[PDB]
Each structure stands twice: as structure tokens, then as C-alpha cells.
Amino acid sequence: SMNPPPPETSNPNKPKRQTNQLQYLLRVVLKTLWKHQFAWPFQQPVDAVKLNLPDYYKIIKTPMDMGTIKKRLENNYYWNAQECIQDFNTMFTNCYIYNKPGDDIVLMAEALEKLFLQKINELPTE
Ligand SMILES: CCn1c2c(c(=O)[nH]c1=O)[C@H]1C(=C(C)N2)C(=O)OCc2ccccc2OCCOc2cc(C)ccc21
């Protein structure tokens, strides 16, 4: 029923790079999704207490959210663009695993995912 610690957004032992692709992921991709009308469920770690979801963190064992991603990008946490893309994909997949296919939140995630995949199709070359 309680929340786990959130995913780390810094770690002095983890290697990292600043690449043009990661800058794009922050300045274009994250910013575009963050401002979307459907972003709000995804802007912070899932609070299973507030949401009365005592099974959330029994079903979702790799939690991810755009607040964490935003901090990771701002903090230069990632080694490459693929690490960040994987975090977005985990976030969307978690929503589809936890929720039923007809749910409103699934429609919202699907709209954000469509936009996300459009923006990463324009991902600049390394
Ligand atoms: C991403 C994590 N997430 C998630 C929800 C969810 O259902 N599934 C998830 O995976 C919830 C939810 C959030 C922040 N996040 C929220 O704010 O819920 C308030 C709430 C509190 C107590 C009781 C019911 C209740 O709302 C029932 C409808 O829930 C909806 C419906 C829509 C359109 C969007 C989100 C949600």
C-alpha cells in the first residue's frame, strides 16, 4: 500500500554524457509532452496512497514518470538517448499493464505516446 522510494535522478557513480540527442529529448520531446493537456497523471511518481492503488507497486516493478525523466535530463543523468527513450517507453507500458484497455487513462497515454513517437522520429543524428 505504501510508495517505494522514487527512481534516482542522480548518482555520482553512474556514467553520463551530454549529447545533441539528449538535449533534443529535453528541449523538444519532454517539453512538448509536459505541456499536453493529458500530461498531469504522468508528471510525478504514482502516489499509490493518494490514488488508493494498493496493488500498483505489486504489478508495476519498474515505475517511471515524466517528472523523473525531466529531472534525469536536467541533471545529465543519462549515458545516451536510448536510456531516456526506454524510460518513456516504460512509463507508457506501465500504464497499459496496470489499467484496462477501455480506460480513460489508457486513451490519454496512447495520445501522448503517439506524440512521443512522432518527436523521436525527428531525433537528430548523433
Ligand atoms: C499514471 C498512474 N495512474 C493514475 C490513475 C489511474 O487510474 N491509473 C494509473 O496508472 C488515476 C490517477 C492518477 C494520477 N494516475 C488519479 O488522479 O486518480 C484519482 C483517483 C483517486 C482515488 C480514487 C479514484 C481516482 O480516480 C479514478 C480515475 O483514475 C484516473 C483517471 C484518469 C482519466 C486519469 C488518471 C487516473
Swiss-Prot record:
<comment type="similarity">
    <text>Belongs to the BET family.</text>
</comment>
<comment type="subunit">
    <text>(Microbial infection) Interacts with bovine papillomavirus type 1 regulatory protein E2. This interactions may serve for the tethering of viral genomes to host mitotic chromosomes allowing successful partitioning of the viral genome during cell division.</text>
</comment>
<feature type="cross-link" description="Glycyl lysine isopeptide (Lys-Gly) (interchain with G-Cter in SUMO2)">
    <location>
        <position position="58"/>
    </location>
</feature>
<comment type="subunit">
    <text>Interacts with p53/TP53; the interaction is direct. Interacts (via CTD region) with CDK9 and CCNT1, acting as an associated component of P-TEFb complex. Interacts with RELA (when acetylated at 'Lys-310'). Interacts (via NET domain) with NSD3, CHD4, BICRA and ATAD5. The interaction with BICRA bridges BRD4 to the GBAF complex. Interacts (via NET domain) with JMJD6 (via JmjC and N-terminal domains); the interaction is stronger in presence of ssRNA and recruits JMJD6 on distal enhancers. Interacts with NSD3. Interacts with NIPBL.</text>
</comment>
<comment type="function">
    <text>Chromatin reader protein that recognizes and binds acetylated histones and plays a key role in transmission of epigenetic memory across cell divisions and transcription regulation. Remains associated with acetylated chromatin throughout the entire cell cycle and provides epigenetic memory for postmitotic G1 gene transcription by preserving acetylated chromatin status and maintaining high-order chromatin structure. During interphase, plays a key role in regulating the transcription of signal-inducible genes by associating with the P-TEFb complex and recruiting it to promoters.</text>
</comment>
<feature type="site" description="Acetylated histone binding">
    <location>
        <position position="99"/>
    </location>
</feature>
<feature type="domain" description="Bromo 1">
    <location>
        <begin position="17"/>
        <end position="123"/>
    </location>
</feature>
<protein>
    <recommendedName>
        <fullName>Bromodomain-containing protein 4</fullName>
    </recommendedName>
</protein>
